[PDB]
């Protein structure tokens, strides 16, 4: 996260860390949506151009963290994966369209003041909150600059941008399964997700029922916090039918 602040303890209890076993390193961010399901971005697991193809056995999921490099004894939980499901139409060949994946944990995690699931939005919430100008929040232990890394979880609140502007900022083809967020050069506010943050959540807080809903997944961006560019996120609600399906089928 670039130009973000340190999160508070228990601010994002659904934030997850995808860690690799060998080498031991931070792979991506992810979110806890049920006591047995984690949601992340498919390009964190599969991206053939760079020979990335991880399997259950190569990842660990760490939940309840604040510190990036420390094993927070008696606070965080480490789960193993049972299964990884990538969206059948994830487009890694062109624009990372449908960059979403679900991971089933080996065993359920118990909630605590530090571990708690995020809600997934329903058509009505999507409709009333996914409007350009409204702000969302992104969290992660990603880079602090394009070209270092933070000791704790960082947070930044960004507004959603009108789709025309998003399309007019890149050469890449935007589909209806993506949305972009960030500030315009002419706003005097900065912020963006960056490398290391992919897979984590973009959430909004409903003013009707006070719950936090995850509207997007950090997907891609060109550089980090560059002026004129924006960050793109997977549109969770448009892919929700796929989510429901694998969770009530597996």
């Amino acid at each position: 996260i670039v130009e973000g602040s340190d999160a508070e303890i228990g601010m994002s209890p659904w934030q997850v860390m995808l860690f690799r076993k060998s080498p031991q390193e931070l792979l991506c961010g992810a979110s806890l949506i049920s006591d047995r399901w984690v949601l992340t971005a498919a390009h964190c697991l599969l991206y053939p151009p760079w020979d990335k193809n991880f399997t259950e056995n190569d990842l660990l999921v760490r939940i309840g963290k604040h510190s990036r490099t420390r094993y927070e004894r008696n606070i965080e939980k480490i789960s193993m994966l049972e299964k990884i499901y990538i969206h059948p139409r994830y487009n890694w060949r062109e624009n990372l369209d449908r960059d979403i994946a679900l991971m089933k944990l080996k065993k359920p995690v118990a909630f605590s003041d530090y571990i708690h699931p995020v809600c997934l939005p329903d058509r009505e919430t999507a409709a009333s909150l996914l409007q350009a100008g409204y702000k969302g929040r992104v969290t992660g232990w990603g880079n602090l600059k394009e070209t270092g890394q933070p000791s704790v979880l960082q947070v930044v609140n960004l507004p959603i941008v009108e789709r025309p502007v998003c399309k007019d900022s890149t050469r890449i083809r935007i589909t209806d399964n993506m949305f972009c967020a960030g500030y315009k050069p002419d706003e005097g506010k900065r912020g963006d997700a960056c490398e290391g943050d992919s897979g984590g959540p973009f959430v909004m807080k409903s003013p009707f029922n006070n719950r936090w809903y995850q509207m997007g997944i950090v997907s891609w961006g060109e550089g980090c916090d560059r002026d004129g560019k924006y960050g793109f996120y997977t549109h969770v609600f448009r892919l929700k039918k796929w989510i429901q399906k694998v969770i009530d089928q597996f």
Partner: peptide
Amino acid sequence: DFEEIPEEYLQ
């Protein structure tokens, strides 16, 4: 820079 974690989570 990551601190080690309990061997039991590698297996």
